[PDB]
Amino acid sequence: PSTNKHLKNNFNSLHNQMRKMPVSHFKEALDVPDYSGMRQSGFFAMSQGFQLNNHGYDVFIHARRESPQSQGKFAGDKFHISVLRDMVPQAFQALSGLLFSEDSPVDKWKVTDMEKVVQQARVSLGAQFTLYIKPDQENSQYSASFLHKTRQFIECLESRLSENGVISGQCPESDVHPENWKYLSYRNELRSGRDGGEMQRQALREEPFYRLMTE
Numbered sequence: 077p078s079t080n081k082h083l084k085n086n087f088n089s090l091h092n093q094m095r096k097m098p099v100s101h102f103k104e105a106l107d108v109p110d111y112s113g114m115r116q117s118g119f120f121a122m123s124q125g126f127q128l129n130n131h132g133y134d135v136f137i138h139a140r141r142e143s144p145q146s147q148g149k150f151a152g153d154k155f156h157i158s159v160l161r162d163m164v165p166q167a168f169q170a171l172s173g174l175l176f177s178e179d180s181p182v183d184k185w186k187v188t189d190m191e192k193v194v195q196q197a198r199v200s201l202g203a204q205f206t207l208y209i210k211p212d213q214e215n216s217q218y219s220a221s222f223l224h225k226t227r228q229f230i231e232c233l234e235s236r237l238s239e240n241g242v243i244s245g246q247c248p249e250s251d252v253h254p255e256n257w258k259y260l261s262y263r264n265e266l267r268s269g270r271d272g273g274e275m276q277r278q279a280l281r282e283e284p285f286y287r288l289m290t291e
Contacts, residue, residue: 079151080267082217083284091288093220100228102180104173111165115189124176135192135199136206139175144183146222148211152266153285155209155230157259158202158245159237164190167204167259170240171233181226184208202245203261218285227289230260249273252280254290262286 083090105124109116114137117128122142130137159167168187174180188204207230212222237259244258250268251261264283268276280286 079148079211079216079218080284083288087284087288090218090220090223091291094224094227094288097221097224100179100225102174102177102229102232105176105178106173108172108176110172111168111187114168114187115191125178126176130189135189136186137189138186139184141183145181146183146210146212147214148216148218150208150210151216152264153209154263155207156203156248156251156261156263157205157207157233157237158247158261159204159259160243160245161190161195161200161204163242163245164188164204166240167237167242170236170242171205174229174232174236181212181222181229182207182209198246198248203248203251204245223288230257230289234258234260250276252277252286257290262289 108123109121114128115130117130117137119129119131121128125143126139126141128137128139157167157171164187175182175185185205185207187206188199190200190204193199209226211218213219234257242259247253247261248263250272251263253261262280264280264285267279267283269279
């Protein structure tokens with residue numbers, strides 16, 4: 077009895093429902109900070125419903141909707157966004173409207189503060205954004221409409237980045253992604269074994285959430 081068990085037993089149903097739904101529209105927000113502003117969130121800041129902070133003891137600027145739209149418990153699903161290091165600020169600004177959108181299915185996310193990490197380290201080369209996904213229903217099961225909304229959202233991020241000519245960064249070796257995702261990648265540590273490497277990625281690819289997001 078769990079989020080994943082539900083996805084497995086309703087695998088085809090969810091996919092069939094999703095593929096029949098109309099394109100989702102996300103009203104992008106304009107009153108959002110630019111990357112420098114984001115880095116200046118300090119102890120506390122707020123932009124269109126999202127609480128922000130960049131504590132000195134961390135290297136990420138966290139964003140969390142005060143009013144969470146998903147009522148389920150986090151089941152490990154998350155996405156990373158990888159862009160060329162020198163383009164993090166450009167990528168942030170390009171995605172800011174969607175990331176702060178009243179329509180975004182993502183209640184919580186964070187972006188790396190490039191000034192706090194070593195240029196040579198992998199944290200600077202990719203996965204500069206992290207989007208946390210959690211089941212929308214109180215019983216912690218994903219609804220077809222939410223899955224569709226989440227996939228449409230992620231694909232919207234992909235198109236915005238490509239349209240802005242943003243160059244892809246280096247995807248983490250721990251994540252997986254299909255050929256058509258140039259910036260997005262998926263990961264779920266809740267079930268990523270202890271083997272890592274190829275074995276870990278193959279396990280992720282069989283995850284029903286990932287397959288519903290890509291097939």
